[PDB]
Amino acid sequence: IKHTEYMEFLKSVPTFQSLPEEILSKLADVLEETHYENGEYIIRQGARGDTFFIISKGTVNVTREDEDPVFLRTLGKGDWFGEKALQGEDVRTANVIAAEAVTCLVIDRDSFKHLIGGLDDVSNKAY
């Protein structure tokens, strides 16, 4: 049941909407569904990371020391984050904190580097 749910969800995300269905299937098989509550750190700035996150429920706040924290933006269902530590250096460039009950579909580096990393929408992500 979860497998089909994951594939339908991934398809609905514009970044992933055009992937071959077998690649979507592989992603659905390797991802880990992870749950957070309000105020829980998902990512800390300056940590070293190896995971990519797709939000399937809730919202998160992104902040950065750029010594007090500054608010960058809020991300929500269908948005994703954590790609910068998978591009070149592995350092996290911002904090990501749950703003309510959150579900993320988590993709590790082993799968990301084959199935997602070649996507321009991810590799050339502007901000």
Tell which one of 7, 10, 13, 85 touches ligand CMP (CB under 6 A): 85
Site string for ligand CMP, 40-79 (x = CB under 6 A): ---x-----x------------x---------xx------
Residue 5 assigned ligand-binding role: no
How many CB atoms neighbour CB 107 within 10 A?
A: 23
Tell which one of 55, 94, 97, 102 touches ligand CMP (CB under 6 A): 94
> Closest Cα partner for 59 from 13, 107, 96?
96
**CA-to-CA separations, 76 to 22, 80, 100, 101, in angstroms, rounded:** 26, 8, 10, 11
> Closest Cα partner for 60 from 14, 109, 94?
94
Site string for ligand CMP, 27-46 (x = CB under 6 A): ----------------x---
